[model samples]
Target chain A: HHSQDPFSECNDEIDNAKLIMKERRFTASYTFAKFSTGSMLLTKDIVGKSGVSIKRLPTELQRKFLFDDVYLDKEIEKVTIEARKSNPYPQISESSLLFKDALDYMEKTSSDYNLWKLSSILFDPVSYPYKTDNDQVKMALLKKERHCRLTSWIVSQIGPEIEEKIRNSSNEIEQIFLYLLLNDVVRASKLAIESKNGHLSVLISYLGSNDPRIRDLAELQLQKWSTGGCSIDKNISKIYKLLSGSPFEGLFSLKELESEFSWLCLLNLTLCYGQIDEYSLESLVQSHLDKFSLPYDDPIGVIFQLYAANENTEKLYKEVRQRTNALDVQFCWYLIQTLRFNGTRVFSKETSDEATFAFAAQLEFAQLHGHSLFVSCFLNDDKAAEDTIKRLVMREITLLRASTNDHILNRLKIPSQLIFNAQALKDRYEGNYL
Target chain B: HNELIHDAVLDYYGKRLATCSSDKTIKIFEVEGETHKLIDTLTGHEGPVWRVDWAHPKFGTILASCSYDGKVLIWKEENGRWSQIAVHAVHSASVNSVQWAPHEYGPLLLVASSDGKVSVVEFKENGTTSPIIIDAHAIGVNSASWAPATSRKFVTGGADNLVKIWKYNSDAQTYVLESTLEGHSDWVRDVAWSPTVLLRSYLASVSQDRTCIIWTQDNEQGPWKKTLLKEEKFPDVLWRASWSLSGNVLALSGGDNKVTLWKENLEGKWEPAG
Candidate 1:
């Protein structure tokens, strides 16, 4: 109603919208699901603030500019962190109160185990949210989940604090679960007393007990079990009651990490009985396969693992391929990385261009993905990974002075010739992973 | 009406859309400008139906579904009434995926199951019979795709994080494992063999490891080669990857809730597919 020229609207709010979206940073972020388009509310914000005509645009542009995170980077990062603990394509929003509340509690105080139960999270930090500006925090002593969380907490924190209390009074069920998960809070002192176990003591001042009788009895029992290893028989009902509730509300949580402990518990059972490891392992994996469909979650480190302890290539290869949600990306670097599977390894051939191929490919991959900068800063905050990644990036650059994939002989931005086996080098380098 | 819609497919004519879900019912709707009318609701599976596929129109509006109950049901639209044409109980566990073999192969259906197996079934004068059963992976199989080049060849993604290629051995009437394409470090979610184009064909797989690999073959019937399409950058696992009608474009979706489109350039590299 206001303009006679066809281009009149072009110079207004739509132009600014166009300019902002045109930024390479904005476009690159689209691949990360950063500026997803779907919310009319978000689009209304844009339309109201900038006067950009939301409806008078092409279908693609409407989809493109409908959702922008121009003012929500921090909130988005929090959401990303929250998402890693769930299945891919979760429906939780960035502002989910449940996640925010649990993380809020976890970050400040000892997380009440009951708090995270309301959300999809499995184990979380004990008192601290699962936060990490660096690795010093990834496994921060404050983090805790459930059974595993409690077990680790008891060994690492509670045991030392409560050891004197328990020894002096009525025994708690959490008591044996402690010695079962025995840690070395007292192991150092015990070793010092034995001398053969890496202890250093020059004076009697290190001995703390005022009661000579108690010290004598404790030292005698410790040395008596030193050669045979400590063993205590747990009663059936006591174990059952402990398992059912006292120490833990539940062993598995719906979030990630449930499978890992489940696998470990199963393995623990097998090892205690000395069951033939291979047959039991294969049968367990096989039975699991028989009951579910393929492409179920990968049961390795982060989420699950099969100690498939030792299966040959065919069975191991066959089994690992069908796992869901892979974790510890390279728990086995050999067949998984070294022996590259290019549509069956046979009817077959080889690569002698192989060394050239592997080196050149690693170089190409490193450069294309900005591995050094990313691996150092974003992958981990530690300075060590950056130092190592920078060295390898330079090494790959040097390897390119032989070649494959291209003839460009592009000038190295930074070059070094220090070399190693290409395949193993990649395994060690861990290029651009997070 | 309530659960997640797991899969949806369009009929060959593009006039009918069929959808299946955790609701354990399959809904058929007629596509129209005048109206999108619900035509039928087929209910037979005991568990959530995982996927649906439309068979070639030459077979007269045949629809196939795979379910959590370890079964695949084929239905035919006859006289405006849908009836189960065949029920396949080949999978040992829950069936996770299903696809109809190209019509050129003559009424063939393929199903993949959580039981780590892929079965190829053909409807014949004597009901349905499986021509092949691949102990494809050690864990459950999540997805299956018929190679675009031939109905006899197919690929599957397993929970074990591997993609296995199978070539039907017509003489043995069984599928021999043609190749095991490995690169996915996590569980592989889906794989699609690109239709033969120019002189070559490409196959793509997306995984929980957040990597999508595109396997290319230079020769018509040659060993496939691997090219990493994406690795470790996406915040979530990659659940699916497929080629466009032209086979020149690729699309992927996963935990990130982003549907990315990619295409190979003249320099033999992937850029955003248009």
Candidate 2:
């Protein structure tokens, strides 16, 4: 049953079809098969006929017969055949007319299959003036109602090589088509029952694309997927695993995938997956603290104090007091208030002596150093307001009893009264109290 | 071209002028007919005198000296004899630097301290009892300079990494902070405003940060622009910078024992000149 000569039957069929098509005998099946095979092949037939010895037909008659007659009036087909033998393809002046007639036929007949063919013809970069006229054509098509099945079928018709070519194209038209294809996937996912699987795969691939805008759009689509009841747990876990490894190490590794693309991939994965977990938070604190001692800037020290105070109050109090004593008195005062407010214990007998000595010493330094740790401490702690006042009054009496320079004594007189007033208002709950 | 006869040794001739050192002594000399003679040695300060400024406008021949021993001594030339006018110890720590504020009416001297303060003392005809002391910085204020104009605005740089613009508030009777320019990574060592050039709102501050930053204010309600003018790092620190009479040129000197000049280009940008 296998044919030894493949071209024997194909040649006979082409001869018979050429004769019939010459005599204006093209039918729906014939036109469908001819156009479906390739528009370029059909154009070659028309060119061969136009060069032959036949009476030239009018331009409009030729266009109508070639594009419309085969599916409708047979007489027009005969006229089109005779006209095509003299002048087949339309000139530049008739380009708009050809497009309009083809579009009208597609709309009236509701032939999504032929419409898809026409769309492909219009989008063909080799034939169409893609560099010059694509923007206008694309804008016109954007307003039209697209057929999803026809689009999918057209996409399937594109060979993998051609599809890759379009995807890799740097032209604006290709970019527009790609975005339109993604939008179609999103729309289809909403309408079709089984489209999420395909749509998600396409969107995930976009997350690894070189374009940041495309990656962000993919993120938005994934968010929509979550809203539409798609289980993204597996996807989230994949992203987390990829991000858990160091991005700098992976991108810079000699054996790893060395590409600028890897950086974008890693960044997007990290942004989408890295949440502040307990282990990471503790490691961050330990690293920052190990490099810098207490009171040496103390940038992350406050955050650690708050975290410990919230999680375990006793541990927070013990650690804060131990670390606080190592800092300058000014810094210690601020640290204590922050700890107390965050639920760590304050005003206990164990810390009272250190606190009193710190407060008194801060006052002595304030006169000489012009920096007051006590004031900052009082401002920070609400519960220690009462004790801070008593400590301030006692500090003033102690400073007065101790002999000092006349200039020092004079400066302390006014400052002492200010401290006493600040102490007196500790219990008074006023709205304007600082 | 005219052939000018230049036969004298310029270096030897320049060395005859008396040069005072920070070693608490001033060596004076008399140059008559090409022969030099030692006139006198003036010694009063217990420690190094950090600064000496000759008075202008009102007391032309009068001079003020601030010493590391925390004393401000006023001197005047009377009948060819240099004599001390007043000695006051107003600062607790060493008076690191001093200058006479450019004033037309009364005696005004600005003194800075290592203990982080500045005092503006005014003397009267009868007595020097009423001296105003102004607390200026949180750390030692090493240098201060008066704007060489009638305005009561001056600039100060200190160890606090702050270059501050100060305006004498007549109502408050003290110098108040107008704006604080704070981009230096290290202590600001010197500040200088351009002379002769009437820039209503811009001045330059040089620091131990190895850079000189220029600050500009458009108006009283300010959104200031801070521009790093020049940056040079050496083994020794830069101590002071000053603008010339035209304001187009600048001079810098410090522990390096070498003086350097800075000039601006067509782009109005400053760079060190060889």
Candidate 3:
């Protein structure tokens, strides 16, 4: 590792940096001179004794400092595809999902209605619990189960289905099978009993029952019927196959119920309740999403896919880190910080330090001093944070109105120290012997 | 054509170049891309010119040349013709270095002379401003650099094997000795105060001791801390120390003709940046 220097390729940067520094120095001197004495005439002397001529300066390799202001609203409006949907608006969703929760916080804070609360929320670790590996899987399954119930409730609202379904065994079993797949076993049993299949109704009821012994016996009996060559109706036998922990090969081909949500529900059932238990939830989610071909081009879609795949911290952070734009990066940085505050280290120490400072520099150069100072405070280095805060405070005091200066100084402890120093210096000079 | 050039400096916009030579003359040139045209030749110094520095363009195409003749001459261009504007004959010995303070501090000239005195002279719109001279070092001042645009402070290196910091006493209306730093075993050759608005101020000094020291002060009232750029001395005596425009990176040039860049790490260790 010591054999070769890591920054050896910085020769180009060094050359450009040298030129840029030289140019800055020249201008600094020129401005100093102009302010000090003044300039000369451009007219030519007949004898060429004091002839002055102007020449061109290097234009390439513009200084790399991010000080220029680019009309942010328009660029963010047009350059919205990389991460966020559009602009830097504070869009929020109240779901318990981590990403959505972060947006909610940003929305509240951006509206200036809940900024103080946001700070408290971000700083308080006690508000969030340490998540376990199975936590995300549980939440995923819980939501899918809730969706099944709602869709089954919608199924119950349809009238005249029994009279039409009584004679048509094919359509009847199809209805019953869909209800069972949706975890609406009561509705499946009601349909079975109405269709004169009381025995089928008892089995379906047992499947719906919370009694462990009853469900176990029902599962074994159902398994017995499938394997012992019982002359069960071919269509009815398919329900037994799915309920007995064997996958329905035809589930993917269902035309009416085909959807990403439906696919996720089926995959969750297979991983959580099916007897095969061969694939992990994360692996199945990845494969099923791959097979179904959901586009991961959008930031929300990609993040949602990752969330469903149980990628909470490391991989989730790497995706956020890939965003290059300031608003995109800052938004994600806020989100990643929220996740960290919520007891999951979404950002590593090394990457977060660099990213935090980078974002802080951008904000500082963009003339968003307060935001820059706030972001800098989140950096891991103590010395860096203190100095950045001091620098920005002093800079604004010099460049901006003094009335607003007192407001910023009062808002934070670090800025307060700078103000104290400023006052003390004033007092010192006041008392000095003249 | 074969005369040895002692120093070269570009004008404020880097469009004009000024070169001082051992031939006891200064040449002004307009440079563009790969070509340059000589504008004028100034012949006023009695001995070889040692260094050349350009004032701000607001001062109107003004240049300052220091010489072995102990005279600091100011040259200006008017009506497309170059002429001597003012002569500062204060130094009793060869003038070694001359630099302008940041424009924020107005038209102040910082001069380091072999007479062991550092003079800061202010130039005005109507007439020349008197110089506030300070007995800087016991031997001689080798180099002097103004601090950032924030405050009235500067750092000077001297042949007395020391680095000194000076701050303008507002009440006294003159610069006073702020602090004298001791580290180098030999004469300090060059010192540069980084032009950063960072809360912490930085100063880099290179010496004939073959080592570079990075000095930092966290606050205005804080004591300066020094960190060695390297554990061992360089291959040859270090000649100059220059900081970049933004990042507090120091580039050190040595007598061995090798250049190295250094930066302070998170742990405050001075490491080679490249």
Candidate 4:
């Protein structure tokens, strides 16, 4: 009698993967010209004449560690959808169904908001002890779920004609899939070697997951040669998402409804007073901003238009600042979201500001909005530019390596070396290349 | 609309209309009642005018346009007359897109080109300034859009089959390459950041790979998280991806000449919208 293992299951996937890989040699655009700018390894995409382009791989074998953001996004969609459909969930009760239906009164099954409500109900703490009022959960059910279904709802995302081709033929991608979703390594080595690109991409999927395994092994397998240049793990994204033992574990509620009730309260307040300017207005605008604790000058402007459209707001946004202004006066953002130009007008009238406050109105508004998109007007609004730019460069550009005898030196060809100082160094360098 | 009206938009209140064409002209239509009438036909682009974006009324009723002539012109309304405020010849190739940053970013403008360069023209105290020029894509940058949040980050789709993210670098004082996003197996066509404020930040990119992808980050400064909104093997080559103002629905345009709206459900994925 012949016994079969799930081992046989992985082969077709590997074979089909080869066919897909043949279509893949894309632009990592692999050319960088960087110099040793201290402790870090910077990769520069060299410009003309004095141009230099490069990449900083920890090991020599790190040249091709690339992943297509789209494929992996699809992969996560599969993982999320599978995690969702598998129902690693508590059973729904009759009352739970009715509670969902009552909530369904709000579901736009047609809109992402519908799934958000359903996801809230499905993962809601009231019945299932799940925390549904989450950005991650919202997508997993609606925003993320609808996206998954549109991409791969039938968790068997790797099926159809490919499945038929796989059953008919056996190949290397099978071992890679097993490496990803299956296990048993030593035998999987060939699968890793056969499609170095495909395997690395698949490894990227596995390694970048919320729960990753074989990260070092995956890199080691891809590091066939090229010593001291393979810090491939840098390419493996360490991202966290709805990755629990089913995203619905602990068999208890996180008290999401209690919190969501407050959230909906904040949400309704935001919806109701898009144009209101009371102390409570801050709470409404805070909710309007999707509830992120971001640093904003005029959180109201951003919250009101989402993109802040009024030029007076633009004028005010540029003029506000941190250093004390000569005109340290103050005013009110007394109104927000209503209708037409009338309900839409800022009670603090920008036209009225230029007319009344004359030149000092900017500082007054800066006092009002707490940002300097106005104080700087079109100048270098330090607080505004620095605050946003600070968000980016808070960490010095992490220089991750430096290498001698790189392709850039070879291309430069000028003694560039001019090293009459060290005879052995020149000989060694020359001999090595020779 | 005439001669393949390259772009069109329903202004802030949806009461006005702006249209640009390869016919080397831009026309503003007065959308009065159910009827529409051409209010003006301004001619300045020596080559085809490819894209037009309205400055928020916050920026004094401004209109910005880019053209195949390798230039971008910003026009303003002065005493009932529209005049060119500034003309920038930045890109060496056709200017593919001209977009104003969310006013929250404070009067910034992002320009993309076929020469693989993307420039951020800050309306600083100086003239329309290019504080930095990023050699974004090796092939070409087709479109660029600002992330609709307070922080200044933007996404670009490229001919290199890649989607890239760029952020303003304070230390370097330039818009440097932040991340290179991968997913499309073919040339990428468009990238549109979710217009959601604060935390609902996401990026959707469409490609000739016949696929569309959605990208998000775990934190403000984290590795971009990704997922495909559409897998390949399609009837058409995808060219453009866009998000609704509320960041709810996403719309895509394909080479087969169709536009489709996509929305999310309670599940964490997206599908066709009603």
Chain A TM-score, cand. 4: 0.17
DockQ of each: 0.02, 0.01, 0.05, 0.01
Per-residue lDDT over A1-434 for candidate 1, one digit per residue giving the tens place of the 0 to 100 score: 76577766757755654553332112212211111111110011111211111221111111111122221222223332211122211211222123223343233333322223312122122345656788765543332233233234324333443455446534433343233324332443343345442322122222222244433443444445444645632321223222221112222211132242333332222222112222333344343333223334523222112322223443443445434324222212212322222221211112212122222222222232122122121121122222333334433433343432111222111112222333334332332222
Residue A253, candidate 1: C-alpha displacement in angstroms: 80
Error of 4 at A247 (Å): 38
lDDT of each: 0.46, 0.43, 0.56, 0.45
Most accurate candidate by TM-score: 3
The TM-scores of all predictions, comma-separated, are 0.40, 0.35, 0.48, 0.40
lDDT of 4 by residue, A129-167 (tens): 445777555434442333222223112222342344335
For candidate 4, the docking band is incorrect
- lDDT (10s digit) by residue, model 2, range A303-348: 3433324445445545554443333343343344333433333544
Which CAPRI quality tier does the interface of model 1 achieve?
incorrect
Q: Give the candidate number with the greatest DockQ.
A: 3
Selected candidate, larger TM-score, 2 vs 4: 4
lDDT rank, highest first?
A: 3, 1, 4, 2
Weakest lDDT window of 10 consecutive positions for candidate 1 chain A: A33-42
Pairwise DockQ winner, candidates 1 and 3: 3
> What docking grade applies to model 2?
incorrect
User: Model 2 over residues B1-274: C-alpha lDDT tens digits?
Assistant: 1011000000111222222334565444453333445565557887545555555423534567776567877776565677887876778877756667654536687788767788777887674646767777787786777765433767788878887777877788887777677888766767776643222355667666567777656555766678777545644555556653312345554435344555553345676653
**How many steric clashes between backbone atoms does each model show?**
47, 1, 19, 87
